[model samples]
Target: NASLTPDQVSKKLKQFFSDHLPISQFMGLEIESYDGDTLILTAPLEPNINDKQTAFGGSLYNAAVMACWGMVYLKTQEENIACNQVVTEGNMKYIAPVYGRIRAICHAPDEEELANFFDHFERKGKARISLEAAIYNDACVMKIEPETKPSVKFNGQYAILKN
Candidate 1:
């Protein structure tokens, strides 16, 4: 069972980001959707454009890493766990150039994996999980399914620790 509504989680995320994440705040990183199963974060290309008229790779990575990070935070909130989260490392693959808005999506991990992560954290004060985030050019149209090939892919290892 989820402890917070989508609006509630997003609200908390907004406040936290604005308070602590200056890069995220200036880049216009925003919550596109957060429904407990998947987290979608977006940013406009206008603020993150490269000299060649495309989304900067750094910005694409930012959108993606945040999506992955936000997913973990939402998971912790779902369980009423107040923990500090950190992305220990990230591996990214850029397959296509994004010429428009960037949409990054991070789907929740398997229920079993999630339970184990939580159990370890609750017992030992820290836990780690790996998550992948996908970035798409444009809005992914409707229904969160993109017809175009993935513009970028990111895999990150996240550490969740008691605060």
Candidate 2:
């Protein structure tokens, strides 16, 4: 719905995660911001750090997962899917160790695929879409190099089903 602004999306995600996924609270996951079909989430270093003072592997993964899931939620709301969505699969490639906070950015299905996803879902009662989530920061530019700072790459498939 065009009526749901970005602020509302951010707030809804915050409450949804807090109420249904309490672990998100401990992970310090927050809907930093979003635009179009992309959503971004952030996590604090203290809450996600490991013994080496770097962000934990699981924390990084969680950030990516939340980012992708949030994108799907927002996209579905935009496309008026109104279905229960779930992650069907995920693959992650951990790069260097993150020494600071975590920022995950995820992209939803493009316009054409989005339209087809919803059309298929309405007709078949289920549809699936592939999304990618990434760990990024100011230092990391278009790509991550061996000598560059830490980053993560996450590719996942999400499915929507009618109730």
Candidate 3:
């Protein structure tokens, strides 16, 4: 079987949003790309910008949270699993202001850990996963560069419920 490429996943994500998520459209959120290990989402400034002329705190938090949520969605879809996914918990940090469009980069756990995660889910029909994200102003600047400072940081936990 062929693996899902970034372009493939990006298209599916856009379709998923179209069908199930109107808020994404309202915010103009875009499924930018995905490597095999990481996924990225972008939101334009016009809709999400706030009174201070930066990204709204709530909007940033939602973007960060959704990035991780979608990561799990991508994984389950690849495994052909039908599940109701939700965020069980989240912690976010507003390290700085997003003065431009918002780009959230979500880094998935390594495959070994993901194997354990899916294994647990397959056995129990319910599983939990934690993901982290970095937010920045530019679409080009990214996380873990050791040099590019993040404008926002988030750690979130999600659970899948399959019947």
Candidate 4:
């Protein structure tokens, strides 16, 4: 039964982030909210005054990582699987100065897409589906391709579900 309301998921995400993750405590990390497909996160303007006055690269990437992780976590909840986590392969672009609030919104794989992905994996017991995520600043024009998605299974643990 893949039945869940957005409000219900929103509540779960709010509680999970506020309690377990504690990401909000991190400097510059402000998880605005989580609707259904997208997760809204913000990084305030204040530049790192001491550390060369540069926006901490690690913090920027961390924001993107958590955004996607939260997206997948919510998706996996539909199947009742304890989605461990996600690891980024690498990031290519170094965005410009973190002027104003940096925002990141994540999009999830659609049901049809996920179905095709699972089907392919079913045949080979492993598959790779490319997923995309991006980051934008206040202008909402500047963007960086932070991470690429390739859904793959390891040791046959792909799509483990209960009926």
Candidate 5:
């Protein structure tokens, strides 16, 4: 197994997004942590906030998508799998206003799910996998106002294409 350290994945992903998705840089997107199975990405509210002084809905969803995308990229890189990953479809629900900074977290699928994904890919040269992502406050402390809650969650389907 070609496991990657957090720093290594962070460096590679930074460069990858810089080259391919410059908008991520404009939005101040960052890799907060990566542990092979999970990835946490963050974006400052300054660049993604709406008129309400909270995060824009589009930015929150974009962060979640990138977190899930980062998970797939990191896993394929760890396994030394030469594949191209892309988001096929995604859905998101905003539970509350994201204030301050937005931290998006994504988890890799379970073993059986992963195995089935690869098995299909090995035979068909393509496969789809489901990934879940969520947004939370950095400190896990959000004032529960009588009018609002505090969280954002999303799920995405990504495709892996073999060369």
Candidate 6:
């Protein structure tokens, strides 16, 4: 719990993913960068699929979700909030079909947003922050991969008292 700073938290989170998520490498997920609640991860479709087939849809979803979730998890850990401190609610959107290798860059909750979240949680003992995970195709400029947009809502509560 020495991570009283965000940077330390990010590092630990990246390390956690790098060690735990073996499929990350399988899907070509690159931990490009991260700050606070935001993280950038990339994956190539060519390696995940064969002959432009969308059979790798599940794999793509897993990476996207893990990348986005890891961002929040890291931020929380960095703040010294403890592993089971807060609950999470998430939603995922798959806009277009990813044909090739691409980037899934996620921006963490900004300072103001984070501040508001902490304030509300401290005051009411609970708060929820919604975020977005964008998946882009390397081949396209604006179009994203389209599949059944998978949405997940994480309702997390801090173990304020600590068990």
lDDT of 2 by residue, 25-95 (tens): 99889987786756778889998989999988898988988888888888776665578989999888887
TM-scores for all candidates: the values are 0.91, 0.88, 0.91, 0.63, 0.87, 0.63
Model 3: per-residue Cα lDDT at residue 147:
78
The residue pairs found clashing in candidate 3 are none
lDDT of 2: 0.80
Per-residue lDDT of model 5, residues 1-163, tens digit only? 3346767766888888889998899899998877666778888899999999999999999998998888888777665678889899999998788898888877778878887888898899999998888776645532223443438878999999988
Q: Rank the candidates by lDDT, best first.
A: 1, 3, 5, 2, 6, 4
Query: What is the number of backbone collisions in each predicted candidate, taken in the order shown?
Result: 0, 0, 0, 0, 0, 18
Per-residue lDDT, model 4, residue 131, is 44
Per-residue CA lDDT of model 4 for 132-159, tens digit only, reads 4455543453223334321111110123
lDDT of each: 0.86, 0.80, 0.83, 0.52, 0.81, 0.58
Best by lDDT: 1
lDDT of 3 by residue, 49-113 (tens): 88889999888988888889888888877776778898999999998889888888898788987
Q: Give residue 40's error in model 2 in angstroms.
A: 1.0
lDDT of 5: 0.81
Which scores greater on TM-score, model 2 or model 5? Answer: 2
Residue pairs in steric clash, candidate 4?
Answer: none
Error of 3 at 151 (Å): 1.0
For model 5, the stretches where C-alpha displacement exceeds 4 angstroms are 1-3, 138-150
True-structure lDDT of candidate 1 = 0.86
Task: Tell me how far the alpha carbon of residue 42 in candidate 1 is from the true structure, in angstroms, after superposition.
Answer: 0.8
